[PDB]
Design an enzyme around this catalytic site. Structure first.
Site: not given
Ligand SMILES: [Mg+2]
Ligand SMILES: [Mg+2]
Ligand SMILES: [Mg+2]
Ligand SMILES: [Mg+2]
Ligand SMILES: [Mg+2]
Lengths: 283, 283, 283, 283
Positions: B144, B238
């Site tokens: 990520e 998120e």
């Molecule tokens: Mg994230």
């Protein structure tokens, strides 16, 4: 204070004699009304030399700073009042018209906890006295809101407004930064609407600190809102395109932000001037 | 892995028996295909219990983590591999299909300088070891990209892509986060386009970690790009809406991000579902 | 057929010996690859003259037209064929590489009802035969979708795609117009995505026919989708800033679209170039 | 008038006894403050029935219309006055608080030429007359700008404001439509800003007349400008989802616009509610 501005960091990081001239001449070659002059080492700035340069090139100016950690107003307000008063002195000797920026703390200031009322009390008493000192010198005093990674005290326009309203000094203005609003404002234009009549200075900065017009800032929303509130302050280009790799750690920038500072001044200043015209800013 | 996901932080960021039950049933009430489970304390997770709850609710899972400082791969690659391998053993025990997140370093990691070649050497060898271990368990391995304030190594999709190609594994995917691309990508869709060969996981997060659809992320550009490259992976929401004040230091948020988790879940998952339908994301 | 283009209407829609040189010299002056030459009054085209100008200034060309009412293909396909085949002749003599635009009907065509089976059968038969005539000449043949007020037959990118599939000719491409897409596509990028197999020509036109970059077209979505589908054709500027008032009725335009063609050329062309570079459109 | 509204066309265009019931109960079911009642066939609108329904469900109302061609005010101002006054008489009898829409002409009106002084002279006198009649009945009178293909007289908010200022009547307001602004305004928020003194009614309509939030209208710029000018007025949803195929010619719509009035009411009103709260539209 009204018109188009450019931050001196498009050319100079320091403010020695030659750096001052190169930045001031450049800002005049690009037809800016304002240059924004950073104050990083107060002893090192020659106030008379800078005033002469500005007079030669028919330029106006504001100063900006970031408080060094020994002067952070949230824990050491008396050191902040001394450092800001000292900065305001050299600003006023320069011919500048305002001191702005992160005049209330640092750009790597964290406590690890949400900001407390004792901290905001120290800020209020520190900024109250210095803006007072600014008032005796006829200067204005700005507060730039920055994102949560840099400071824990003033992130959104709403918090900056609430601070200004508590001090009660008509010569303190709110200063917003489109790079930081892009993270902090729930819809960037909502930062500008919250600031309204306190908003007198903008950093127009792309979302990656590159070229305005080529990133993620919603410039139509921004110029929509500045126009709708009747904005008549300064619009200053802020970009990191001329920062050497050495400056990396101070600005948290690890890879080139744009092709070069030449491209950013050519295209970024013309973009801000063409959007200002589309939305009749200063009309 | 294909479909819609929600990060377990919407119900807790501990993962005891009760937190696991609350998050997994929560994700099932919202018809999610996946929950993303964060691995914070490897000795404490009851992996067998998680597995049975996932099967009970018909929910699939990905695991994610942030490397703790003693294990940052850039400076201590052997320690990174030992930690990543243990985390992967937990993920496989729970029945997860991948381990993703900041699997190469920290979210508060700086050297004060740009990334050097020896740091990337270290990353490359550490992730190639652990991606191989993940392969022996049947799991995929994710990287990520995060913004420059959290990490100095993997900021842009291009960097993430170039690191995948260096490692040369076939079970590693690129993972992008719209909150982070909103800062790091020169036009957010350019991040998705750069990753078109390796993009298999998204964090769909609003520009302020609030509610998707109510910030500064250009969702139409995001979804257009996901559609045009034929995205075939997971879209996981998120947000920090459930994060209590006591977590403020670990996430560097000092202001509430939204009204409540129930609102973010309701309004945000609907928005992502509606934009997915508009752009025909899964056919 | 790849590169940047400008429509001859930026100088004039007349095409006598004077207008052609001015238009072609103007297009070269701005570094364009293509000029789009409107075919209006066919007998007044000296094509050997036009071909000489083109190869002198190093410019390529496509021709465009609108069917006049007695040659509308939905109701008079034979007159459509003869008119199209005649335009294709002079396009070829000029050395243009394609004929495109509203080659299938009119810009003021309306039956009061949705388009019927039989109207599409007429279009198909007409374009099928004219596209074959274009093949013998070496020309490609384009179909430009336009909005619901101008035409009732080809409004959406998917309509254009279905028509091209129906005809079955390998030398017909879809032509899309950001001004029309702004009304017809459910999110402008979806037209580009839907045409992804046949899209070879764009009209890059602002939402008010003014200056691209200074209106309501979402250019980040437009360009993201072009890059992500791997677009290979021509990007041609379309704007009405050069049209005199006597053209008002012919283009349903009752007030000035901007403040001059020179401004639209200078600012609009450079905007399409910088966007193409930002999204790396041509490699 | 202040609040959220919905166009009765979401349920029907006929206003017989059961359609009036269907539409008023429907608006009340979605918690609207206002319903917009089209006036098309005057002698079939039962005023006692409509007034009774409005007060039972707690719904307020505005009426709207387009002038039939025999009564276009630009060329037949005496006839316009008659038709407007009769429509105003019905609106007052229903309990409605205003008459608005294209009250100065038609939606397929064009001379073929830019609008003339004499045309605006006729509008001025005809609207002056009927707005004074509306004042006698305790009603406000609106003028809705529409796009260049529907009408050649009132296309931009600026034109609307000039007309309003010429007539000089304290009960005429400006009425804008995001669908039409998306073509006519150079930057959609500029229309709202231009009308800031007289804007009291909006048609909130997607760029394809479909579902607000799933098209090309820049809603963040729209809601921002509304917030920044302190809009007090009605935000009324307008969409063509419920309209039968036999109505294609009247609205120039040749294919389905969304997937049913149900989804459009559900998702669109939800999107306007959430945007309105994000920007704090009514305080
Ligand atoms: Mg994230
Ligand atoms: Mg700044
Ligand atoms: Mg090996
Ligand atoms: Mg066109
Ligand atoms: Mg309307």
């Amino acid at each position: 204070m009204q018109g188009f501005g450019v931050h001196a960091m498009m050319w100079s990081l320091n403010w020695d004699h030659e750096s001052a001239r190169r930045a001031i001449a450049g800002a005049a070659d690009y037809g800016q009304d304002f240059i924004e002059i950073p104050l990083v080492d107060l002893p090192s700035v020659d106030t008379a030399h800078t005033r002469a340069l500005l007079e030669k090139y028919g330029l106006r100016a504001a100063c900006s700073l970031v408080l060094p950690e020994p002067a952070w107003a949230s824990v050491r307000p008396e050191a902040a009042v001394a450092h800001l008063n000292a900065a305001l002195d050299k600003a006023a000797e320069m011919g500048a018209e305002a001191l702005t920026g992160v005049t209330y703390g640092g750009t790597s200031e964290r406590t690890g906890f949400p900001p407390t009322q004792a901290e905001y009390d120290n800020l209020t008493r520190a900024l109250s006295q210095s803006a007072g000192h600014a008032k005796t010198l006829g200067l204005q005093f700005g507060i730039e809101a920055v994102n949560r990674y840099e400071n824990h005290l003033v992130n959104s326009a709403e918090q900056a407004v609430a601070l200004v309203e508590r001090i009660g000094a008509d010569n303190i203005f709110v200063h917003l930064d489109t790079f930081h609003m892009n993270m902090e404002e729930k819809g960037i234009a909502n930062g500008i609407i919250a600031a309204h009549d306190y908003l007198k200075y903008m950093h127009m900065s792309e979302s990656d600190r590159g070229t305005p017009g080529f990133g993620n800032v919603a410039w139509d929303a921004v110029f929509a809102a500045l126009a709708a509130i009747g904005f008549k302050g300064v619009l200053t280009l802020e970009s990191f395109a001329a920062m050497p790799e050495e400056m990396a750690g101070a600005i948290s920038t690890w890879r080139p932000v744009a092709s070069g500072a030449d491209e950013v001044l050519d295209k970024g200043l013309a973009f801000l001037r063409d959007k200002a015209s589309q939305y009749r800013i200063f009309g």
